[PDB]
Amino acid sequence: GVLATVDGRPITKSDFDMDFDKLKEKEKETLIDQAIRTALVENEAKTEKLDSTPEFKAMMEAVKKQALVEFWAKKQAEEVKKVQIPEKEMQDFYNANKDQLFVKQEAHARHILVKTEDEAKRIISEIDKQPKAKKEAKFIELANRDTIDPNSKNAQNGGDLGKFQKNQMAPDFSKAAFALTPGDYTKTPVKTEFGYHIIYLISKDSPVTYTYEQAKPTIKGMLQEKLFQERMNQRIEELRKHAKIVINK
Amino acid sequence: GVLATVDGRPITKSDFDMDFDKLKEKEKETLIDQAIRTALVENEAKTEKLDSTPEFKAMMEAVKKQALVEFWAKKQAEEVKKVQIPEKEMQDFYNANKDQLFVKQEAHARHILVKTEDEAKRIISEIDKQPKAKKEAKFIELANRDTIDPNSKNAQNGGDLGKFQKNQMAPDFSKAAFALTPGDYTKTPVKTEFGYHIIYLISKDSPVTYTYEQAKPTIKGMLQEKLFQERMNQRIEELRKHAKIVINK
Known part of the structure; x- marks a missing residue:
């Protein structure tokens, strides 16, 4: 799956961001070019040491922090995904929230x-x-x-x-x-x-x-989201206790 | 504008992402906490060396490349913003595209x-x-x-x-x-x-x-966008010429 090279450097399906093989042959062509264009820009940015500049570095720190944070949160979400949501939790939710959301x-x-x-x-x-x-x-x-x-x-x-x-x-x-x-x-x-x-x-x-059966996908999602938020909150409140936090207003 | 500290480390208005001072006093409170929560997650992620892991590093390279690329593109866009779009270009566009877009x-x-x-x-x-x-x-x-x-x-x-x-x-x-x-x-x-x-x-x-006058903001934006795309395309096509590009299908 070396799709192309730019100055030897492979472009590969890893260059893309959420399925490449399900894409129409001409859609693929268009994406490979986007990634070629990206790579040409990157090369140029690096030659110009856009990455060593303070503007960029500052901005990169924010980006890296955000990334590291979302990474950690993704991991929380994955512990949630392994848990089966019981049929019962789902009908209960449907009944309770039917008129309001469905x-x-x-x-x-x-x-x-x-x-x-x-x-x-x-x-x-x-x-x-x-x-x-x-x-x-x-x-x-x-x-x-x-x-x-x-x-x-x-x-x-x-x-x-x-x-x-x-x-x-x-x-x-x-x-x-x-x-x-x-x-x-x-x-x-x-x-x-x-x-x-x-x-x-x-x-x-x-x-x-909407019937239960029509609602159930959305219900499943909403219950995972709640489990996820609960999970993260719980963990973050534990972290909160070991830190010294001061607000200034 | 040290809004809070977490374990001494300042939270500041630089912790936010596109105006903090225009925000309602209680909106501010909510944001400071989000950023406090972010910082607690970050600290934890670093303690756990989530950032040294291969999963993350791989992902961080993509993110950094994308960032560096958008950074470079932002700069292109800024050369465009300094150019006044002539009134004439704008009415012409309005007239030509009225029935279609306005x-x-x-x-x-x-x-x-x-x-x-x-x-x-x-x-x-x-x-x-x-x-x-x-x-x-x-x-x-x-x-x-x-x-x-x-x-x-x-x-x-x-x-x-x-x-x-x-x-x-x-x-x-x-x-x-x-x-x-x-x-x-x-x-x-x-x-x-x-x-x-x-x-x-x-x-x-x-x-x-829509009248010209109502359309004109959108028109201005669309013309800058076109100037911007033209600018970037032009530059990227120049970069393209100095590289050896091979597609494999």
Whole structure:
């Protein structure tokens, strides 16, 4: 698998980065040239001692550290891969997280963000007072006056959030949002990280629930990822204990 | 800007990778910890001489070569950045490429791919024979029988391509596609890389043309990119001439 030489120096399949032999014959040609071009650049960079310069050396230290770190993390991940994830862990996860992660569904809604539960509560009562026909415009009006969402505030768009997938918004905000009938709004504020939301649902399409079997690949990945993060965290917290760490602010 | 120390060793803003001071005070906290965690991993990796191992060393050579190469390319790019792109080059580009790159427009269409111009021509005549009402189903039928698009062939979906943006399909295929009235198909084949297409337009929304002024940032970028590629190509072709290059297939 010496694919080419440049000034004698072999180009080989090891010159590539994540399958070469599965590539179309003409794709291969294109890659060999890229690697030829790389090698010509490298030779030139070395002749010019771009690598001995301080700019590069400094930068190379960062790169090497990052590399060494990812290397170490890769190794953590490999201990995880050897562990079988039990079928049971996977169905449990599917059941618990189905509605949150395994439902394709799109909504258009608008929201109002406020700082306190009572402000949110006040906003809901105001809208509650309005005849059905008036509720949407009242929501829009209050959003423009009272929302603290900067973009919403700046846009004066009635707190329009545009269309979003169920799995792509914060979970408890999505649950609330998608739980509504179109044309209704939440009668109870929704606390998040940012404050309290009132959500008005404009529209939503019909949800499609992925089955266990369709979900299972993604589930497997997510559980390994969690095992991996747990593993690394555990190890890093042990390292943390043997070091003297001082923050300056 | 010593943000923290780990066992005496400073963590500094140089530990980060493309602005730290623009970051929210709590974002900063989170980053300092990431870098603390990085440093703990690095220390451990070094104690374990993960860096002296052959696995790593081999991998580090690739990384260093790539780095040295990108470094050299960055430098090429910087000679380009010092050059002012004339207003004239930019309007010319805008005018020439407007319809192709600066029009937001979505279409739903289906196509048939065949190997030769005469096969494509045959398909068009067949459809031409059909009463208006029958043309779509005839197109679908022929696509299923005759298309050579593997996915289309495998799916038997009447060569349905789904919905696509004007700027996100091959240009001459988009021009043809978007030039159609809905419910019409191309009376002339469209040669591309893959063969000859017959395109049937199902639907399209209304196009929005970005103005020069809206386009100009992207235009500037695209022209620098071209200058950059030209520059690098030119330099690399000079290097190519001084080397002995042999491919083995």
